[PDB]
């Protein structure tokens, strides 16, 4: 069956190369999680540095796309970096052509449309990645938009990606059934970051040191990643709780 | 070396009560030399009428091109093009050749078959639409035609009155232009009959 080798339909109407690309998504064995505050959007991903020879500072799956847009990838790093460089190019071209900063959901749609073309043209393989885009959009406010190798995308109140994703998901769905609202009702990003880490710990049943996480925060008019120290501060706050 | 005035010729269109008129002269020349006494400058695609003044090769070319485009239109739309729509097709097509234009002064006349409304328009050689309720003029004696139309014209003329006005406007404007005249044709256009009259005029 060569219908399993390129992006053409199988008899039951499926694209196996898209399905197999979704499986490559989990090769890194990393779980990601994004939630929205009132004023901010927080994205946390597990950080795992197995080899002692690695420079731990260069090991990341969170990318600064634009001034305002951050992206976390679940998938192998080469495809992650391909997707990163392309999103950066697209967000810069948009700003030059149309005179305003590319919105989160529009970049998401554009990367999803690119992903779709790989599912329809034979000579391009899909990328084995899921892209989570976060920002505080000037029109829509705190935003989470996620893209997969199918070229699917949608907005989220919160989301999780990776192997243990289903546990994190139901944990968050439970919080939002209780809380009755669209977001984390919190003033400061520091306390939304604490919420994100706390609910990841509950769902995964594991503790984290400062070196086991990597954190991204979007506020109005910038996205930034936390240093080891910024997270230590954050982990200490959770300890005394 | 002024393409718009090598061959000569004029077109004028007027609206009346539930009718339009479009008229043209019959001269084709090569500067001083009168060559042809029968070069008509008014064509029609269904019920929509187009007059073209200017360089005669571009008159012939644009007619052949609009017959082509309105034929394909009719086959795909399953109805004749309307004057408002044709006007936009002329405009698009002229502006497509922005940096290599057709040296012409096109004039559209017709009655919208649905609304019953009389419609005229004119354009510059690159596609700009002048839409006027009253009259449109084009060609080597456009100054003379503007003068005649602006005095002679009054609104809501019956087809048989409108005929006298447009005819007198064209006839007396052509007589003051070296490169226009040599015979004239006038189309009187009502909702569902079109009368075409050849005017007797001085042959100098």
């Amino acid at each position: 069956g060569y219908d399993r080798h390129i992006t053409i339909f199988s008899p039951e109407g499926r694209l196996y190369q898209v399905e197999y690309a979704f499986k490559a998504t989990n090769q890194t064995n990393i779980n990601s999680l994004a939630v929205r505050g009132k004023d901010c959007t927080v994205v946390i991903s597990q950080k795992k540095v197995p080899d002692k020879l690695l420079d731990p500072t260069t090991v990341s799956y969170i990318f600064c796309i634009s001034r305002t847009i951050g992206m976390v990838v679940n998938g192998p790093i080469p495809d992650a970096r391909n997707a990163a460089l392309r999103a950066k190019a697209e967000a810069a071209e948009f700003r030059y052509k149309y005179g305003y900063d590319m919105p989160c959901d529009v970049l998401a749609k554009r990367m999803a449309n690119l992903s779709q073309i790989y599912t329809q043209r034979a000579y391009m393989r899909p990328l084995g990645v899921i892209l989570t885009f976060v920002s505080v959009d000037e029109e829509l406010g705190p935003s989470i938009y996620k893209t997969d190798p199918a070229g699917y995308y949608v907005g989220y109140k919160a989301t999780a990606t990776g192997p243990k994703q289903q546990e994190i998901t139901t944990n968050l769905e439970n919080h939002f059934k209780k809380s009755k609202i669209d977001h984390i009702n919190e003033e400061s990003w520091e306390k939304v970051v604490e919420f994100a880490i706390t609910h990841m710990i509950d769902a995964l049943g594991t503790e984290f040191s400062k070196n086991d996480l990597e954190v991204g925060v979007a506020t109005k008019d910038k996205f930034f990643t936390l240093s080891a120290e910024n997270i230590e501060e954050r982990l200490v706050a959770i300890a005394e709780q | 070396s002024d393409p718009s005035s090598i061959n000569g010729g004029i077109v004028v269109a007027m609206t009346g009560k539930d009718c339009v008129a479009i008229a043209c002269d019959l001269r084709l020349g090569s500067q001083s030399l009168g060559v042809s006494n029968k070069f008509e400058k008014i064509f029609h695609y269904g019920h929509v009428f187009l007059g073209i003044t200017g360089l005669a090769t571009d008159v012939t070319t644009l007619n052949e091109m609009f017959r082509y485009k309105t034929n394909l239109y009719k086959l795909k739309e399953e109805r004749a093009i309307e004057p408002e729509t044709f006007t936009q097709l002329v405009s698009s097509s002229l502006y497509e050749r922005r940096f290599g234009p057709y040296f012409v002064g096109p004039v559209v006349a017709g009655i919208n078959s649905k609304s019953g409304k009389p419609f005229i328009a004119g354009f510059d050689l690159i596609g700009c639409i002048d839409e006027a309720k009253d009259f449109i003029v084009s060609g080597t004696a456009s100054d003379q035609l503007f003068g005649m139309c602006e005095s002679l014209y009054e609104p809501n003329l019956e087809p048989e009155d409108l005929f006298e006005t447009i005819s007198q406007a064209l006839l007396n404007a052509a007589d003051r232009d070296a490169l226009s005249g040599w015979g004239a044709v006038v189309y009187i256009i009502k909702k569902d009959e079109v009368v075409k009259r050849y005017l007797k005029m001085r042959q100098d």
């Binding site: 008899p11 039951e12 109407g13 907005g155 989220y156 | 729509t85």
Partner: protein
């Protein structure tokens, strides 16, 4: 590097089937149910917003898209394929019509262009067919109200009413029972909601149903006044609130 696939990936089998079109239609069968009904004074298109996760915000996913002020589209099948077809459909309405005639294309000729794009993906080198069927509802001055289905092959047909995807067989039977040539637009919306109730498992409300109409002109949606002969879009998306009003009287 570059595309070396300049040969067709859709070819005739000995039986005269086109494998990849057949398989695209199988993808459409698996797709969520969508339908369209044509009244005397308008058209309704409706589908289910079967949400992937409950954490998803399914209003950010529009299955019913405006193509022109007077034309709307809905699909069954692969969502990404639909999204890029809507992008190409909107653009071709401009490049191959509006930029020439200074007016939006009539329904059948925009459909004709969409059909053309989908046919090319059936025969061009190095591509698979689109895995969607579209229902396109539209109005134009000379043709009035119309409803069209477009299939992966590039074939299109006009319908008084129809359905596509999952429960299409049952849905079409139900529409045959109820459809008459004297339906008022509100009658057609009522029938559309009944028909869609059959092939919806869980929640049935204004947040799980996407419904748009091609109806009267909406000057209140135009965005400007002062030109009396511009009277605004005939395509209107029914709000979550508006759908729930008609579910109490269901």
């Amino acid at each position: 590097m570059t595309d070396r696939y300049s040969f067709s990936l859709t070819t005739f089998s000995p039986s005269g089937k086109l494998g990849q079109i057949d398989y695209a239609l199988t993808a459409v069968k698996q797709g969520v149910t969508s339908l369209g009904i044509k009244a005397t004074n308008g058209v309704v298109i409706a589908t289910e917003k079967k949400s992937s996760s409950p954490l998803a915000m399914s209003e950010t996913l529009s299955k019913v898209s405006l193509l022109t002020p007077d034309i709307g589209a809905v699909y069954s099948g692969m969502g990404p394929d639909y999204r890029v077809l809507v992008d190409k459909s909107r653009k071709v309405a401009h490049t191959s019509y509006k930029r020439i005639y200074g007016e939006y294309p009539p329904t059948k000729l925009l459909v004709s262009e969409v059909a053309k794009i989908m046919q090319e993906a059936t025969q061009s080198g190095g591509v698979r067919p689109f895995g969607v069927s579209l229902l396109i509802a539209g109005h134009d001055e000379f043709n009035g109200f119309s409803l069209y289905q477009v299939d992966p092959s590039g074939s299109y047909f006009p319908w008084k009413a129809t359905a596509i995807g999952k429960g299409s067989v049952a849905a079409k039977t139900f529409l045959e029972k109820r459809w008459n040539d004297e339906l008022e637009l509100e009658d057609a919306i009522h029938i559309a909601l009944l028909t869609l109730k059959e092939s919806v498992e869980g929640e049935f409300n204004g947040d799980t149903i996407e419904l748009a109409i091609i109806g009267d002109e909406n000057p209140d949606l135009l965005g400007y006044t002062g030109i009396p002969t511009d009277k605004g879009p005939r395509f209107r998306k029914l709000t979550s609130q508006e759908i729930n009003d008609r579910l109490e009287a269901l």
